[PDB]
């Protein structure tokens, strides 16, 4: 995250670290959506073009983390994955359309003051919150600038940006499964996700039921926190039905 602060302790109980076993390294972020399921971008797992194809025993998920590199000895819990499911229609070839994948845990996790799931939106929540101007929150342990790494989880709040502005800002073709967020240079406030941040959650707090919902998945951007550019995220509601299906399909 660029231009944000260090998150407070247990401020993001649903923040998951996708971690490579060997070389032991942070791949991406991720969100806990039940005690057996985690949600992340499909490009964290598969990107044939750079030769990336992570398998199930290639990875670990770490939940309850705050520190980027330390092992938080009786605070974080590490789990093995049972399955990886990418959206059958994820476009890795042109624009990262449907950059969403589900990892079902080898065993359910126990919740704690540090570990708690995020809610997935319903057509109405999605409908009254996903409005330009509205602010969401991103988190991750990624890059601090486009071109170090943080010791703690970072956080930044961003406004949802109007589609047309979205489009007008890149040469990549933008689909309905995506939304962009950031401040306008006129606005004079910044912050953006950045490499290493991908797969993390973009979330809003309902003013109706005081609950936290994940609206977005950290997807791609032209450089981090560049003036006149905006981060792009998978549109978690547009994809709920797919997410509803696999869980029903072979879920918890």
């Amino acid at each position: 995250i660029v231009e944000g602060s260090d998150a407070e302790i247990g401020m993001s109980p649903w923040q998951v670290m996708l971690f490579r076993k060997s070389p032991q390294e942070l791949l991406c972020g991720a969100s806990l959506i039940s005690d057996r399921w985690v949600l992340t971008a499909a490009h964290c797992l598969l990107y044939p073009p750079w030769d990336k194809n992570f398998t199930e025993n290639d990875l670990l998920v770490r939940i309850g983390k705050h520190s980027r590199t330390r092992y938080e000895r009786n605070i974080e819990k590490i789990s093995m994955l049972e399955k990886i499911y990418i959206h059958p229609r994820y476009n890795w070839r042109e624009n990262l359309d449907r950059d969403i994948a589900l990892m079902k845990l080898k065993k359910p996790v126990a919740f704690s003051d540090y570990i708690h799931p995020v809610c997935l939106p319903d057509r109405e929540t999605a409908a009254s919150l996903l409005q330009a101007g509205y602010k969401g929150r991103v988190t991750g342990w990624g890059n601090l600038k486009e071109t170090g790494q943080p010791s703690v989880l970072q956080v930044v709040n961003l406004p949802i940006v109007e589609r047309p502005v979205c489009k007008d800002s890149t040469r990549i073709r933008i689909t309905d499964n995506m939304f962009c967020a950031g401040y306008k240079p006129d606005e004079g406030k910044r912050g953006d996700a950045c490499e290493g941040d991908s797969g993390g959650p973009f979330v809003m707090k309902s003013p109706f039921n005081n609950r936290w919902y994940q609206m977005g998945i950290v997807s791609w951007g032209e450089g981090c926190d560049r003036d006149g550019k905006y981060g792009f995220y998978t549109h978690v509601f547009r994809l709920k039905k797919w997410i509803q299906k696999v869980i029903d399909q072979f879920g918890e």
């Binding site: 032991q24 942070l26 092992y71 590490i78």
Partner: peptide, 10 residues
């Protein structure tokens, strides 16, 4: 740079 993780998990 990553402190070590427990083998119970590797």
């Amino acid at each position: 740079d990553f402190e070590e993780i427990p083998e119970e998990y590797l």
